[PDB]
Scaffold this active site. Structure first.
Site, short mmCIF file in Angstrom:
data_model
loop_
_atom_site.label_atom_id
_atom_site.label_comp_id
_atom_site.label_asym_id
_atom_site.label_seq_id
_atom_site.Cartn_x
_atom_site.Cartn_y
_atom_site.Cartn_z
N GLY A 32 0.80 -1.18 0.00
CA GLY A 32 0.00 0.00 0.00
C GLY A 32 0.84 1.26 0.00
O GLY A 32 0.42 2.29 -0.56
N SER A 102 0.34 -7.26 0.90
CA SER A 102 -0.74 -6.41 1.41
C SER A 102 -1.68 -6.01 0.26
O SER A 102 -2.18 -6.90 -0.40
CB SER A 102 -0.12 -5.21 2.08
OG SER A 102 -1.13 -4.41 2.70
N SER A 103 -1.88 -4.74 -0.06
CA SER A 103 -2.67 -4.49 -1.30
C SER A 103 -1.94 -4.92 -2.60
O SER A 103 -2.55 -5.06 -3.68
CB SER A 103 -3.05 -3.04 -1.43
OG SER A 103 -1.89 -2.30 -1.74
N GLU A 126 0.71 -11.88 2.72
CA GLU A 126 -0.16 -11.20 3.71
C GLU A 126 -1.29 -10.39 3.06
O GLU A 126 -1.31 -9.16 3.18
CB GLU A 126 0.65 -10.30 4.62
CG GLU A 126 1.56 -11.12 5.45
CD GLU A 126 2.14 -10.46 6.71
OE1 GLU A 126 2.03 -9.24 6.84
OE2 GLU A 126 2.74 -11.18 7.57
N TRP A 183 -2.42 6.99 1.34
CA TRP A 183 -2.77 5.63 1.59
C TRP A 183 -4.02 5.55 2.49
O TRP A 183 -5.03 4.92 2.14
CB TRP A 183 -1.60 4.92 2.26
CG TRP A 183 -1.97 3.49 2.57
CD1 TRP A 183 -2.02 2.44 1.67
CD2 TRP A 183 -2.38 2.95 3.84
NE1 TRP A 183 -2.42 1.30 2.31
CE2 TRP A 183 -2.64 1.57 3.63
CE3 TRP A 183 -2.53 3.49 5.12
CZ2 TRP A 183 -3.05 0.70 4.68
CZ3 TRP A 183 -2.95 2.63 6.18
CH2 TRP A 183 -3.19 1.23 5.93
N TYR A 187 -6.98 3.44 0.78
CA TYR A 187 -6.82 1.99 0.84
C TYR A 187 -7.58 1.25 1.93
O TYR A 187 -8.28 0.31 1.61
CB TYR A 187 -5.35 1.64 0.99
CG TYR A 187 -4.62 1.76 -0.30
CD1 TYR A 187 -3.96 0.68 -0.83
CD2 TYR A 187 -4.65 2.97 -1.06
CE1 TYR A 187 -3.30 0.78 -2.03
CE2 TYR A 187 -4.01 3.07 -2.27
CZ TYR A 187 -3.33 1.99 -2.76
OH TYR A 187 -2.66 2.04 -3.98
N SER A 220 -3.18 -11.91 12.67
CA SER A 220 -3.25 -11.03 11.52
C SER A 220 -3.63 -11.68 10.21
O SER A 220 -4.43 -11.13 9.53
CB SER A 220 -1.98 -10.21 11.36
OG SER A 220 -1.85 -9.32 12.47
N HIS A 242 5.50 -7.86 7.82
CA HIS A 242 4.79 -7.34 6.66
C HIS A 242 5.75 -6.94 5.53
O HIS A 242 5.30 -6.75 4.38
CB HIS A 242 3.92 -6.20 7.08
CG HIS A 242 2.74 -5.93 6.20
ND1 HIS A 242 1.78 -6.88 5.89
CD2 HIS A 242 2.32 -4.76 5.61
CE1 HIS A 242 0.84 -6.32 5.14
NE2 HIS A 242 1.14 -5.04 4.95
#
Lengths: 264, 264
Positions: A32, A102-103, A126, A183, A187, A220, A242
């Site tokens: 992101g 992530s994204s 993730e 972000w 997002y 998570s 992450h």
């Protein structure tokens, strides 16, 4: 030697991008925060093994700042897949392995499902599928409040390595500073609901390699593990949390190289 | 009124135990450290919803230390299951709901598989299936060496709540201080390879509910999540880490209660 340049796409965006190496095409999609300098060491390391590595800042972010509002607001996996294909078309990349977190994870799975002729294989890390409240609420603070918060969440909570995270240098951190508010508004509310993982049979038998960070709290990405297993997708771990490409570049590069050879 | 007594089994163990309430039987099996005072407030809390709750120090540990060496060396899940079934027999508990964490989780799954007429349903938490060199390596050290190391691990690494952990009292920790050496020589090498979960098909359709701690690093119990998912076993989370019944008594008690009620 590395190409550092820009290229424009008809959807309004001027992407900042970097390229290194020759061989099959590997594309590293930012998370992101959109900042591709996070891949710097790896870009070279994956290149040295016979690949053409390409990466870029995401729209509205860092040096791909110049884009129309729809590209960085109400952002979805589908929107971002659409944008990445456009920079791949422009840079004439016909087949690529893609990585994303992530994204970026959400986008790469969506590239895979949506453009199977284009994607040799996809690594997703993730993938966010749940609305997280603490991050959603920050989109109504002052930009400068958001940055202080998010800078800190990155640094201490999810970086997976604060030395490494901080060793990215002042410029990186100055660009992130600007990205955090963008972000936060674009997002957190719209990426999770867009997650292209609800249809288990679309996933089955696709060349997809899913990971979660070994030190991330189980909570998570618990859902990632359940989804991958239910759909028979390979699922494993990377060191860190992450940002394995920041906290553990050598293992990250080796993993990308190794997964790519597998589908090569 | 809580019964706090001792009972003997013809396999040479004199068990310290506790019992409270009236109602269908619920049995709380300790983790490797074998110390049932960890369950203290939850015993009360669970019994207060219509259950007889029984718990006990494990063989060779705390006030159950009067047992032959076979019961606390080369320890395996099938052995612990055998011991538990015997104390159950001594207490005239014909049909029980069972909770167990860690070696306690292997045990309850082994109880469920091996004695289905005796086990109404089984809840298991953080079941070890992988060897852990660093805990394993402690077995060769001097008793006091082992206690300092392991006590520190319990406190800072895996408690999921260091305040609650320390709040157990000086007595509890004095008994734990004695259990560490015993546990290190008896459990880490032999328990994981006896995990009764390599037969997924035998778990399919069983009354079994599996949890991992929300805060536990993902690498620790990733395999539980994979296994539970492959076998169709209900899997989910509890707050904390390795000791939800110390760190989050109230949620623990309610979870035991809801889940048991699901099987009456």
């Amino acid at each position: 030697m590395r190409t550092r340049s820009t290229i424009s796409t008809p959807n309004g965006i001027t992407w900042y991008y970097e390229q290194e190496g020759t061989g099959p095409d590997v594309v590293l999609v930012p998370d992101g925060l959109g900042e591709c300098q996070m891949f710097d060491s790896s870009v070279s390391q994956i290149a040295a093994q016979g690949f053409r590595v390409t990466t870029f800042d995401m729209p509205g972010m860092s040096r791909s700042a110049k884009a129309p509002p729809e590209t960085y607001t109400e952002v979805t996996a589908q929107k971002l897949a659409s944008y990445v294909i456009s920079v791949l078309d422009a840079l004439d990349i016909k087949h690529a392995t893609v990585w994303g977190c992530s994204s970026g994870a959400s986008t790469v799975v969506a590239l895979l499902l949506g453009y199977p002729d284009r994607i040799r294989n996809a690594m997703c890390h993730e993938l966010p599928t749940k609305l997280l409240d603490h991050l959603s609420n920050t989109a109504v603070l002052e930009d400068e409040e958001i940055s202080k918060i998010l800078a800190n969440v990155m640094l201490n909570d999810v970086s997976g390595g604060s030395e490494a995270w901080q060793a990215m240098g002042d410029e990186v951190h100055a660009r992130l500073h600007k990205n955090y508010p963008v972000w936060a508004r674009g997002y957190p509310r719209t990426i999770p609901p867009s997650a292209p993982v609800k249809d288990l049979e679309a996933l089955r038998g696709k060349p997809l390699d899913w990971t979660v960070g070994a030190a991330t709290p189980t909570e998570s990405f618990f859902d990632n593990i359940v989804t991958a297993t239910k759909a028979g997708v390979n699922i494993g771990l990377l060191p860190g949390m992450h940002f394995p490409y920041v906290s553990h570049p050598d293992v990250f590069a080796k993993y990308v190289v190794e997964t790519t050879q597998k589908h090569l």
